[PDB]
Design a protein around this ligand. Structure first.
Ligand SMILES: CC(=O)N[C@@H]1[C@@H](O)[C@H](O)[C@@H](CO)O[C@@H]1O
Ligand SMILES: CC(=O)N[C@@H]1[C@@H](O)[C@H](O)[C@@H](CO)O[C@@H]1O
Ligand SMILES: CC(=O)N[C@@H]1[C@@H](O)[C@H](O)[C@@H](CO)O[C@@H]1O
Ligand SMILES: CC(=O)N[C@@H]1[C@@H](O)[C@H](O)[C@@H](CO)O[C@H]1O
Ligand SMILES: CC(=O)N[C@@H]1[C@@H](O)[C@H](O)[C@@H](CO)O[C@H]1O
Ligand SMILES: CC(=O)N[C@@H]1[C@@H](O)[C@H](O)[C@@H](CO)O[C@H]1O
Ligand SMILES: CC(=O)N[C@@H]1[C@@H](O)[C@H](O)[C@@H](CO)O[C@H]1O
Ligand SMILES: CC(=O)N[C@@H]1[C@@H](O)[C@H](O)[C@@H](CO)O[C@H]1O
Ligand SMILES: CC(=O)N[C@@H]1[C@@H](O)[C@H](O)[C@@H](CO)O[C@H]1O
Ligand SMILES: CC(=O)N[C@@H]1[C@@H](O)[C@H](O)[C@@H](CO)O[C@H]1O
Ligand SMILES: CC(=O)N[C@@H]1[C@@H](O)[C@H](O)[C@@H](CO)O[C@H]1O
Ligand SMILES: CC(=O)N[C@@H]1[C@@H](O)[C@H](O)[C@@H](CO)O[C@H]1O
Ligand SMILES: OC[C@H]1O[C@@H](O)[C@@H](O)[C@@H](O)[C@@H]1O
Ligand SMILES: OC[C@H]1O[C@@H](O)[C@@H](O)[C@@H](O)[C@@H]1O
Ligand SMILES: OC[C@H]1O[C@@H](O)[C@@H](O)[C@@H](O)[C@@H]1O
Ligand SMILES: OC[C@H]1O[C@@H](O)[C@@H](O)[C@@H](O)[C@@H]1O
Ligand SMILES: OC[C@H]1O[C@@H](O)[C@@H](O)[C@@H](O)[C@@H]1O
Ligand SMILES: OC[C@H]1O[C@@H](O)[C@@H](O)[C@@H](O)[C@@H]1O
Lengths: 53, 81, 66, 390, 81, 390, 81, 390, 53, 66, 53, 66
């Protein structure tokens, strides 16, 4: 269970709320404003989203 | 051999056991003596061959292995062994 | 046939991208995000307008299946 | 082991559905593939084209490839007395040749010179081959129409129907569901070609090559099998002698033929019939089909998933389940979201039902992408099974 | 057969009914015996052929179907049937 | 049924008229066409070239195409004694050949070696063909000169005259009208060619081809029909034997010839004469012609149009009429305008007259274009017939 | 025929005048009877052929024209005529 | 009839002269041509290359083209008992073949099945051909050196000498004049080729073709003529039978060979030697030659021109003359101008002399172009003959 | 008769008077003075000529 | 022959036109309209004079048949 | 004789004297001084040379 | 061989010309007309000197045969 236990949580919480993804890019494109450097946010955000920390 | 006819002419059905022996058969015109020299003469079967043995009066035979001396005769024999 | 060869060719690539970027939902979800794009075609200014005003049709058609 | 499994196990499977009601739906049938059709309030059906064979195609020409000779007879005349003859030279079963040979005193002639000689031998074919012409029409396609129910076996065959590009629209009855009506077209298979048969093994060969083969033959519509044409192709007449001439026949040509056909497309066959891999385009109507089992009770009981839920090659799943508290009944199937608020996905198996207590009822369904709850059954233990489709 | 001459030499007009029989005719130099072996000997008609039968003394015949043994003779016969 | 009808019924019809008086008028005569001539106070005449044939043309060469052989004789000598001979080798009716053949003790010779042999057979031709040469002169054209009167029949032939490009000017008498004088020229028909005759059927063939034919022949001026040249063309000498040699003749060549002439222009013929489609240019003078019937009375009576007025292929009409009150008389014909004020059109039939009571007198006339009154007869019932020419 | 041997085994040199007649010759093991059926049997000359006549006990002959019934024998004859 | 005439009658004649004294003079010798050499105070000589032949050239391979077969013997074993054998299978004069044939109860075997059979026949070649290899060396050229004297005949042959490209410088003696020394080189004739001999008639053929010929052969250095290689090329083994098998030999191949060599350069020959048309380059020295007859008297007498002065193909003339008052003497010849003032032209015949009274002494001379006096003899009747060279 | 009854009248009246045609061109060439536009007269005139209207 | 080929050729065309334009009548009708044209040839000025003065001969000859 | 009688005389007189030819060119090259026009002399001279006129 | 081909080639042409222009006589005749040319080679001025000074050798060699 330790292999998928960190992943499976995310793959659920998105299927419940598509939203935080939809606006994520807005947080992204307004943060760091360069390509990859602006992508790492859109991963970091959608990843910190299903978390409580 | 069995003596029969082919269009009025005498016909000889020659079997294997006659190879090498003078073939004689009576005819209105006296006794006929045919000579069979066929090297391929074998057993009477489906593979027959049939041809004529010409009359030869005081003439040496040439390019033939069958001939009679009184009346032309047809001959038939098998080649099987 | 070339036109049929590339037919699946240009479609599968452009398609999957549309099966990822969009592809959230249907009905009143698809039409909205669809309809708003068609607005950008009328307005804007810059060239992208050439892509957006088309992308609307892309969405609206998938909503027009019915 | 269950009805509709064959198509699920196939990699080439098309899903077709009518955009209208009572309308015709088009489908394309191919060997090795299947098509699944669906419609609102209609059972889901599976279609497969399993056989394509020509029945009793016209025989063009019979070629003899091995023969024997019997009763070889020779006749010859002296120089000056014309061409000799043999009456068997009028018997179509014999092969004959006319020649000239030296004659003279040594063999019964008065003059030395060339004489006419003739030799005939009965020709008996021992092994022949025949080339046939396949007409696009008179071709017969076999199609199996199987109800996608999920019922079990391990007595439930799909309806088998045979049609011809000349037969009319077919009305196939499916025990329990009504009839399905369909029409097909051999829509693009070529036949200036010929099909050569060498003792239960056939090949597809071009014409004018078959017709040029140097072998004795007979017009297709023959039954005598005696009056061969151009027998000299398998016969050789040695140089003649004054009163006799030998005739020998070539040996079998089956071999010369075999190692001569290597390259040409080989054609399978059985029961004398030739088989091909056909291609069909059909249109079907379902207005006369209906669900088998409507007006039953909604199972009010329990199910135990017989075994591991399976994933198909088509974004669908096959869930085995077996009752439990009730009549041979309808099943409550429903795929919803994690919150059980809205319905998602859909059934490929429709109006799934149980026929017996302890009778694994396979069910094929299509879960939406992502997460979903597979709710089988009712309120003692409505079976919530989580599922993730990647 | 009708016995006539052709330039001092004896000539034989041979008819159909004589095929196969020894031809004899007296001559100052004794009795002459010609032998006719012509296979094509037929009925006397317009289609005649005429040629010579050589004298043959103790020599076997070769490439011929007519010959006499005492005095060379001409022969004529039809080929009709 | 009436005189001058033949030309009216022809599609190819020329109308010629002399622009002078006593002058010559030129006309062109062709097979299948006719020419109608007219002149002031002269009868209208019809001219037609009906036949063009060569009479007794020079015979170039007679070719034998089928023969028989008789009395075949052979003579041969031993090696060393020169070439044998047969006196019939001097008789032109025989075909002979000299050869060499092996000889020896077996056939009457002292030495073995090649000897001279000779064979002859009487050659009798059974069927021959002959090619003739047609000279432009000596060709004979037949021309019919018919008076355009309209008289009836159903005894009134036009004068027939035969001429040659070497004959002098012709003076043809036309019973009742006088004579007409004319001269013709075969004005451009070729003859380095030859005309081949195979039993009443002929062809036109090029020379040097006819002369090259490999068949026995005889110079044209022959009558013996025996001394054929190059008989070996139809004869074959088999390989000789010590004392005899066979000779056979080829079969008829009529067939080889027929299917060999296909392509070359076939020429019709009859009574041994060859026929052609000639072309003539002639000049004629009418100073000795005059109208038949001048000095009669002007019919004073009635006519009933026998039947429906007819339109010809030449902008003219043929009106049948039959008397009525009078002598065999002149007819009053006249085509005027609707107002009967001026004369329009003209007659092709001139000085139309009636010979008998109840004798349909056909009349060919040329109405002007448009509307006109055809006034036949006199004051009891002058026959006003309206006519419109489109 | 001349009776000789070929490697300890009996060998028969058969001449033309024996065609068609039973060939008998004494041997320690009794009397041997070979049967010659060769169609091509001719005059003894340079063109000889030589081969073996197998022993055949209560078996019909097949594909052969020579055989003996007591002791295998070699045979030789010419083909000339 | 006179010495030196052969070269005068030739169209291809070269005139060579040394530009030095005691030096070497080069000349080119060809078949059908001759070379005339001249030098101050030396006799004029004629050179001709008449023969070029290879003597005893190495024999490469002997091919048999016709053979006979005798003592054909067959041996065979039953299925299971290995491969049969015949000791003559070790005798190189036999041709043998190993095969398999059906066996069984009908022919002396316990088991039915394939058995081993072997057949051999003595192979006797009756007619063969041999190809030889001609080495440039060992070729022998024959050259005739004739003194250009004009003496008569109708005993006076030119010296004949035979040389090889390997022989040393030749010193040829010419009776009466001394010796002439010469050396030759076969200066450019090819030999990867071969010379095929089919019974006294030869051809030049390419190698690898000769070596590929499908016929029995023997290495060149053989004399047995028995142990032929690849005899099967002229032998055919018929299908075997249980205990016997027939073997026949093909017929002569002389014919197949002849009509197969058509095209390849034919080579003449005689006495077993091959002949060619050679080409030589030689150098000769005349320091040991001298005029035959110096120190005689100057004829003081008369000559009568035997016949019509002749013109040669080389701007020269041949005057026949015969004494007259004197010893076998020198002749006074001299060609001057019309005025007899200066000497013109020159003699090809040098130191012309008379051997007998009434002995036509031919003399070849070269008159200048135009007019000249040919002064033969001395003061009773010095013979002034006018001559014009065009 | 209704097919040729309008035509046949003209085809007569001209055959009676060639004149009105002969001078028609004069009326034509002096009227409208261009090609076709001057031809339509020469048809209209010769056509209104055999008429009473 | 070309000259004979075009002979009927150039004539049939030019002829029919003359069988329509002129072709009204004969005798004193043809000669008049004929003779007046020949006047235009002598006079005029402009080139057409080349055609008219010829056309007169065209008419007069047909009147000179007699 | 009339064909060669004019030629043969020259073909002798030169063979007797080569000289008049050898100096002829000198008379030539100094007379007329152009190519052919200077050649016709060298023919005319050597031709009038063996003559007495 | 080319060099041998043209060898007779360039020689036969140049040769015959020398068999006509010169070719008068021999001995004291050839040498003189020969020797005088070799003088022109030493002197002169103009290029022909290239031909003359060679032509002397041409003559002298034919005189040097001996
Ligand atoms: C025509 C003739 O020659 N007749 C005899 C015949 O009587 C005899 O039987 C036979 C052999 O004995 O030889 C010949 O055939
Ligand atoms: C020359 C000669 O041999 N004469 C005889 C003849 O007497 C006899 O009549 C005939 C047949 O009987 O045989 C030969 O011809
Ligand atoms: C082994 C055997 O069968 N022996 C007999 C032999 O005694 C007899 O001589 C012969 C024909 O008579 O037939 C067999 O060969
Ligand atoms: C004339 C005739 O055919 N009779 C006999 C025949 O029976 C006998 O076989 C033959 C010699 O054996 O001699 C023949 O003369
Ligand atoms: C040996 C064989 O099978 N042939 C038979 C033969 O017995 C019969 O006498 C004849 C009748 O047609 O031909 C067939
Ligand atoms: C041509 C034919 O069929 N006739 C005979 C047949 O009757 C016979 O019975 C057979 C023997 O093998 O030989 C053949
Ligand atoms: C010599 C001669 O010709 N006379 C007879 C002849 O009559 C007779 O026919 C013949 C034998 O029959 O014997 C011949 O000797
Ligand atoms: C048979 C025939 O028609 N031939 C006749 C023949 O009778 C006659 O004796 C002879 C006279 O020339 O030739 C001719
Ligand atoms: C060469 C010739 O015409 N002579 C004869 C003729 O007399 C004869 O009568 C005929 C018989 O058919 O044979 C020939
Ligand atoms: C045993 C043996 O070989 N002796 C005899 C033999 O001499 C005789 O030839 C044969 C029948 O004729 O019968 C055999 O038994
Ligand atoms: C018939 C012939 O020429 N063959 C001889 C044969 O006589 C002899 O007995 C034997 C000795 O090797 O072979 C060899
Ligand atoms: C193989 C061989 O040469 N041996 C014999 C030879 O001795 C014999 O004498 C000949 C008869 O033709 O048959 C073979
Ligand atoms: O029925 C009698 C007979 O019929 C069979 C033939 O072989 C005849 O030879 C025989 O005599
Ligand atoms: O074998 C029966 C029949 O065979 C065949 C002939 O030999 C007949 O004569 C005989 O009757
Ligand atoms: O008039 C007599 C006779 O004439 C005729 C010929 O056939 C003669 O042989 C015969 O004797
Ligand atoms: O047939 C009549 C005549 O025929 C010929 C010859 O045979 C004559 O001798 C005979 O008189
Ligand atoms: O010397 C005796 C003998 O030699 C030889 C052979 O043919 C033997 O068969 C024969 O007995
Ligand atoms: O012919 C002489 C010899 O021939 C071989 C054998 O047959 C010998 O036994 C015989 O001695």
């Amino acid at each position: 269970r330790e292999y998928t236990k960190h992943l499976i949580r995310v793959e659920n919480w998105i299927f419940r709320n598509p939203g935080f993804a939809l606006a994520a890019a807005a947080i992204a494109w307004l943060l760091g404003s360069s390509t990859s450097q602006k992508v790492i946010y859109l991963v970091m955000i959608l990843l910190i989203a299903p978390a409580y920390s | 051999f069995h003596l029969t006819t082919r269009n009025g002419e005498p016909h000889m059905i020659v079997s294997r056991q006659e190879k090498g022996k003078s073939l004689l058969f009576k005819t209105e015109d006296g006794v006929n003596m045919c000579t069979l020299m066929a090297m391929d003469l074998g057993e009477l079967c489906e593979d027959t061959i049939t041809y004529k043995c010409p009359l030869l009066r005081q003439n040496e035979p040439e390019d033939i292995d069958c001939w009679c001396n009184s009346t032309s005769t047809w001959v038939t024999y098998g080649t099987c062994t | 046939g070339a036109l049929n060869s590339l037919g699946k060719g240009i479609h599968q690539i452009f398609g999957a991208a549309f099966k990822s970027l969009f592809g959230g939902m249907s009905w009143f979800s698809q039409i909205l995000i669809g309809t708003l794009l068609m607005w950008l075609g009328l307005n804007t200014k810059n060239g992208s307008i050439s892509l957006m005003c088309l992308a609307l049709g892309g969405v609206l058609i998938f909503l027009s299946t019915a | 082991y269950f009805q509709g499994m064959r198509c699920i196990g196939m990699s080439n499977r098309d899903f077709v559905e009518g955009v209208s009601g009572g309308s015709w739906v088009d489908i394309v049938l191919e060997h090795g593939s299947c098509v699944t059709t669906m419609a609102k309030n209609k059972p889901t059906l599976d279609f497969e084209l399993i056989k394509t064979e020509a029945k009793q195609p016209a025989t063009l020409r019979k070629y003899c490839i091995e023969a024997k000779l019997t009763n070889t007879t020779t006749e010859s005349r002296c120089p000056t007395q014309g061409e000799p003859s043999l009456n068997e030279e009028q018997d179509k079963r014999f092969v004959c040749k006319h020649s000239m040979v030296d004659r003279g005193w040594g063999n019964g002639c008065g003059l030395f010179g060339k004489g006419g000689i003739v030799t005939c031998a009965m020709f008996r074919c021992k092994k022949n081959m025949e080339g046939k012409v396949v007409q696009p029409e008179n071709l017969e396609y076999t199609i199996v129409i199987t109800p996608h129910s999920g019922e079990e076996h391990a007595g439930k065959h799909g309806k088998e129907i045979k049609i011809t590009p000349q037969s009319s629209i077919t009305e196939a009855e499916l025990t329990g569901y009504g009839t399905v009506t369909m029409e097909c077209s051999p829509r693009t298979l070529d036949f200036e070609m010929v099909l050569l048969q060498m003792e239960n093994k056939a090949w597809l060969v071009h014409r004018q090559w078959f017709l040029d083969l140097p072998l004795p033959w007979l017009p297709g519509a023959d039954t005598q099998g005696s009056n061969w044409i151009q027998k000299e192709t398998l016969v050789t007449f040695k140089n003649p002698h004054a009163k006799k001439q030998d005739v020998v026949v070539l040996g079998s040509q089956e071999g010369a033929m075999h190692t001569a056909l290597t390259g040409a497309t080989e054609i399978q066959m059985s029961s004398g019939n030739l088989l091909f891999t056909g291609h069909l385009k059909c249109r079907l109507r379902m207005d006369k089909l209906q669900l088998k089992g409507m007006s039953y009770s909604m199972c009010t009981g329990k199910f135990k998933v017989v075994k591991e839920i399976a994933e198909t090659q088509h974004g669908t799943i096959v869930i085995r389940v077996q009752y439990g508290d009730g009549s041979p009944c309808k099943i409550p199937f429903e795929i919803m979201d994690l919150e059980k608020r809205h319905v998602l996905g859909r059934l490929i198996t429709v109006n799934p039902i149980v026929t017996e207590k302890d009778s694994p009822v396979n069910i094929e369904a299509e879960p939406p992408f992502g997460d979903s709850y597979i709710i089988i059954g009712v309120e003692p233990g409505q079976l919530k099974l989580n599922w993730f489709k990647k």
